[PDB]
Symmetry: D2
Subunit: 487 residues, 4 copies
């Protein structure tokens, strides 16, 4: 590919930083493209561009904004297969995933917010005959989104859709691991009629480009998706610089609770989907699987059968449903977690090594891995691995499993498998997580707010509330009576 440039004010423009980076195809190790990195002056240009675009965008009618976002949706539906193939090259996720999920669910959210724009309303409050209050939900102005590498274009859509629908301009910095689909999205928005400057894309590294965005005094809000540690750094800089509003979607160590009355084929199917989709690189994954002691042996056999059915291979093949990890450095981190599990005595049920042979030696492949006989103090149980590593934990009673499920600083997701009406709601109501699934895993409708408790996040994405959280409330009192001064 040609050297990739910045996207500022409706056009590709060269960065003035003089710095570049490379994105690698995780399946082959080849360089996909050299990408320009946005410097401090480039960020300031992007902000001034965004301020100008936002004024035009906010001045339009609500339905005029709705129609433009709807046109972007139509283009995304049309180009789904092209965008999915690029996403697969950049991330290593199978085309069977990217063509069915990444753009489809990203576009689902943009489509949802496009239709809600006319319903964004303030309130009116009577005080007395001679005075009343009304509120406006005003745009924040210029906001910044910082993406992660596991769902690059989906994340860009989930951040930019409510931001734009609420009347803001967004400057989006994709992950340096996966910068390519965000640049295409910028072109698509422009093609739909989005005014110049309303969506600018600045590739770069977190230490420089990301920091320049979090520090800029004229950016009113930062939305970040990534790891827990990175999030704390971003939230600190965003505070010390300009007191910015913040949204954070971080990782988790989410529990999947298998009840004593659960069907074990359904539970194993849910556990598989909660651990090995996108090669385990999903923040919401149910990586602590709690199984009753009396069912543990049978469940382990059922997991092994299904792990054997996993099909790694050509990411463009129809039957491939497992890919390499996003990068070779990330595979190293996942392997260190696997070795930590072995060294602390967790029993390796399957996997635990790289894949070898024709078509695998050049990719960042890790075998689907399951540890069992796990305990709450193990490193692989306490920490997010962000790879295909399932931990199975035995338990005896309902009160115990609720305590152990909740005994973590993470708080993103949770789930329970049970046919019992009382048990399903009773357990779910006690779990300390923002995203809860009963007898399923992973579905994230555009209507459903998602985000973390405790260290897994600040704020929410999706749902009506996220449109509102990209506005700021202005309260206005009309005093029609005579004003009284005590002086």
């Amino acid at each position: 590919m040609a050297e990739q440039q910045l996207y500022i004010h409706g056009k590709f423009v060269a960065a003035t930083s003089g710095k570049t980076f490379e994105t690698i195809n995780p399946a082959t190790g080849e360089v996909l493209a050299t990408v320009q990195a946005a410097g401090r002056e480039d960020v300031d240009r992007a902000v001034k561009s965004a301020q100008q675009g936002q004024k035009v965008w906010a001045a339009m009618s609500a339905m005029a904004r709705s129609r433009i976002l709807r046109k972007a949706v139509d283009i995304l539906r049309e180009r789904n297969d092209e965008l999915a193939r690029l996403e697969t090259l950049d991330t290593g996720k199978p085309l069977s995933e990217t063509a069915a999920v990444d753009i489809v669910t990203g576009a689902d959210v943009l489509e949802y917010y496009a239709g809600l724009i006319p319903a964004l309303e303030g309130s009116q409050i009577p005080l007395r005959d001679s005075s009343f209050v009304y509120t406006r939900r005003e745009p924040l102005g210029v906001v910044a989104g910082i993406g992660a590498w596991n769902y690059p274009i989906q994340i860009a859509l989930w951040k930019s859709a409510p931001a734009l629908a609420a009347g803001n301009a967004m400057i989006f910095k994709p992950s340096e691991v996966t910068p390519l689909t965000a640049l295409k999205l910028a072109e698509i928005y422009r093609e739909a009629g989005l005014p110049d400057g309303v969506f600018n894309v600045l590739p770069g590294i977190g230490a420089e480009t990301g920091q320049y965005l979090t520090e800029h005094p004229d950016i009113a809000k930062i939305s970040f998706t990534g790891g827990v540690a990175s999030g704390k750094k971003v939230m600190a800089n965003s505070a010390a610089s300009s007191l910015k509003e913040v949204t954070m979607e971080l990782g988790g160590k989410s529990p999947l609770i298998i009840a004593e009355d659960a069907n074990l084929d359904l539970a194993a199917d849910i556990a598989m989907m909660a651990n090995f989709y996108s090669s385990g690189q999903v923040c919401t994954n149910g990586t602590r699987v709690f199984v009753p002691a009396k069912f543990k042996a049978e469940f382990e056999h059922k997991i092994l059968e299904r792990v054997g059915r996993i099909r790694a291979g050509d990411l463009f093949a129809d039957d491939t449903n497992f890919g390499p990890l996003v990068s070779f450095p990330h595979r190293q981190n996942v392997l260190r977690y696997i070795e930590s599990g072995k060294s602390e005595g967790a029993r390796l049920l399957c996997g635990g090594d790289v894949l070898k042979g024709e078509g695998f030696d050049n990719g960042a492949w890790v075998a689907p891995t399951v540890f069992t006989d796990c305990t709450d103090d193990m490193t692989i149980v306490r920490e997010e691995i962000f790879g295909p590593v399932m931990s199975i934990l035995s338990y005896d009673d309902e009160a115990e499993v609720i305590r152990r499920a909740n005994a973590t600083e993470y708080g993103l997701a949770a789930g329970v498998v049970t046919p019992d009406l009382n048990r399903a709601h009773r357990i779910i109501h006690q779990l300390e997580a923002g995203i809860c699934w009963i007898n399923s895993w992973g579905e994230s409708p555009a209507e459903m707010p998602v985000g973390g408790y405790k260290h897994s996040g600040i704020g929410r994405e999706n749902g009506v509330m996220t449109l509102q959280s990209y506005t700021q409330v202005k309260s206005i009192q009309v005093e029609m009576g005579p004003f009284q001064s005590i002086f």
Copy 2:
């Protein structure tokens, strides 16, 4: 002198384990009001464990059971309004004519408001398809912390604790070291109303220690802070780095008051007076940049001079006193430096500008009500929040100009316009970059009205229905009644 003040943990006063104390002073006389124990790290952890136990009892009660308890606290606050106001005057130096009419009245108004809204707190339900639906719960955050400021001590304690408790949380409240006394009284009132032990704990202390221990504690889910802009940034950094906590911040401002060319100048002057000299100028929302049309500037100045001459400093318990000392000698020093900066940068001193002297003033940190005119946008007194009784008068020529200059600031808390014209009032207000906007008035903050800052003046909001919701966290729950399909 009063008896030594202790910590309030789990429904009773308890000694601090820090071995540390501080004194709170009467700002009118300089006398020590009380010796106050300072909460250490171990005291904070005890307060957190107490709050965790109390919150579970509190959240398990019915919505109306919580509503009734908060309403009993409201009734006590109404009955003791005058006593609490006098204590607030002793601790802050604000006149009783203010404290007895505003501080507890509006604090209790907000608690009364949220007490009635508890049963209206609802989640949502979203159908996906015949075989699946989603519902949401607005669950309590758990243990939250409020850090108060010294200008409206008990009002802030109420504005923070009322929605936090109404949403099902426990709150640990740290009052300002300058003004800890009324928060301890409020803690007793809550218990007397039936609030379960631990649901509202109060930890006096200094910001460098007690405040930091709260922002760092791993089991506190949210920090709500009111104070200065600089102090706000520090608190927001530690709350994130420590445990990624949710945050609300109500900081200061440099709010503009825009007098339109068709305004009646007596009304404009009355609003400017109330926007600058209430609570001796120690109010975050004060309209400290007063923009007046050039053609009316001279006449407006005369009307300000007349009204400033009427300000009555004196005995804080006398009915006709309407002006008090600043809260401390260090704060007055800072205000005096801003005044000297105004003089040296070429602003014209219209009145005031000196400390007050003589019997009844020598022991307090009094500053005369001060007005500068001929001000320009680059002056330090125009650009920075002074938090004292210093009004800056700025001339302007046209509406587009005044909107630009009003918005050309990092602050964003409040704004106002004075005009009888329908189009002008709404048109100007809609363009101002502030969270709290007043048309032909200033200062009123109804319990129903969300208030907070744009830009560097804040994060989040207080009051209104939205603040009850912002003290809950959303849990989304999907019920999948169809057969789950795995692709493996």
Copy 3:
């Protein structure tokens, strides 16, 4: 007791009709009191009084109204036992019910709405920089409530609490069978500080006093609770007269569906509470009980065992839990339905006759009655009896029972008994009823909107939506730009 008068503008006043009626104690047949009946002139007097009080009431602050209603709650809590004894004398319901439910849940709704008054807000909608819309939720003005006789004071509170909380005045006409507690409520409201005229009470007969209210041109809304046929007459007259807004809470023939996995002790307890509370005089009663054929015999045995524990007797005795019907004319109608069940071939499981002996011969008693072997064409199955008559129907499959449950013009309530997560939600979602209970019956929280599908009602009571439905929306456009005429 002394002859009961009208309550208009904060005082008892003699009716100008020259007409009176008697309310009978259903336990003894004795006259409890003579009550004056409001004539057409009395209604017009009440309306003018209500118009005057409503303006005072609406001009107060929201919290001032809240505090007054909260004081009425405090008075109702204090006088719970006194009001309940009066209610028992008037209705025949046991004190064990009236002291625990009637005033308690009436006050609960008043207390709920008192707290919501400050949350009643309009909206604000930006159109363009130069124009915006805001809305006000204004009082309707003077509204009328027409109560039923089974829960006299509770119905008076459920109608008046949202009406008053929304800033209206209400004229309340209690049922001529049970007028006494509504007059007590009017005194309590005045004692609490309600402005004169805001709650006026006009006892009378439906054929006259009710019709005069529905016809009055200055009444903006009628809220009626009663039988299906009487409801249709009221709603038509409110139209042919002055296009009034209307709410109707009518009767039902609600189905109770017992699933194949239900515990039969739980199912029998739910069926008992759904049929024999308030001697079967409850609109929401589950009077069609669907049971699986394979469990029919066992369920019948459990029902018979529980019916044997029903304790009829002194209505002021602690252990009494069954009362006479509200009147002898109503008993005659209930007995005709029972005889129809016998003649149409339903099998009588128990009861079916009046109660006899010392202490029963002078009261309007009907024994708890159960029919089984019922079919969907029977009169007792198709029509609301409003007496203690349970109909048991056998079914074979889930699709069948849903069709049969829905095959009715009534639409008030429904319920299912099952421990299965999927079955409970799946069945309930398909039932055509406004009030649905899973593994319970009868609970009606103040927060929960309640009302009928199809012929069982119009509109809802309780919940936030009912406060809003006692206001009317005014939309206000502020046009700040130059207005353009095409002429």
Copy 4:
């Protein structure tokens, strides 16, 4: 001439079984536009069973699938705007300058609005205690019926069907016998967009038969009617008497336009003109009582007469024509009777008051733009809705008086005030008893803005988020997870 128009049932045109037909007339020429089949009792029964089947398919789809189908109907309406407008002009007599700019544009605006709101239609969740909670579903009513009026035929069909379909219902729509043609076109457009067969059926006919059969049908859950006040009461009675159906009614008014003492009289005159003579005065919200201060009355009269002189009647397809004939000759007779009552009751005729005559007018149902002044509150033309181009000008002296007189009516649909004063505008508007209030404008009805009448002018509302919800019914569901306790 057009082909004989049939019923539209279940996605296709079908012959009526009533054996009856009626004709629709071109009001500009008196010629027959088309013969139209009238739906009988059995046709209505067929339409209901079709609607029941289609509603199940429609409601089983996802929210976004329904949204996309309505959006495709929007796109077709935008493309066919001019063709539909020309048909509407032929059927109604309204100038193409109106129909091509308003009728389909604002009808499609509302459909477009509700299409996007479908996914935001949500129920609630209410916790009672740890062991029990409530959630609600906003379920479709099922089959609903809309009865349209003849002044805005396709706009009314869209304003009724858009929220009904968006909420998951099927609608059977009965257009006015005067103007049945564009509703049948809309039915074809919905099908072309993918609306499932049966979800929108159209039954032309007369009110006494087809309208009554719909209002009486036991399987129709709700009736929405737009028309005159008298007809509304008959419809609302049969609806209740038959099967207790939910009801919405948008009826007429006698809406007041209040010109304040500080109003610019050219602006006031322009608003009065647009409030009286658009669509030849055949608009329910028209400001037909114009209250003018006594001191300005003579000058206002002059400005009205000057603008009336500019009204351009003529070829309804000419760009500059802005005034049309009335919808029918019987309606013109009613308007002429009202005009004659104004003369005989002593109101002063300023202009108009007769039919228009000459080539191009003798065959149309034309009435000249008419203005009465010196009107009093007891006159028939002041108390009753005329639904023609007849403005009544009434003098007044003070604000309290004009508010009382504005409100002293059984009608309640709209109202407006002309004033530049902030306090006067809101203060007056807050006291008027009308559902639709305009400040310094008239007639704009945004899709976001709920509209409907107080008192005898209506029941319920159209447009806005609340109208989507009012086409659903609430089911409350309690989940009891604790042990159930029986007292028996």
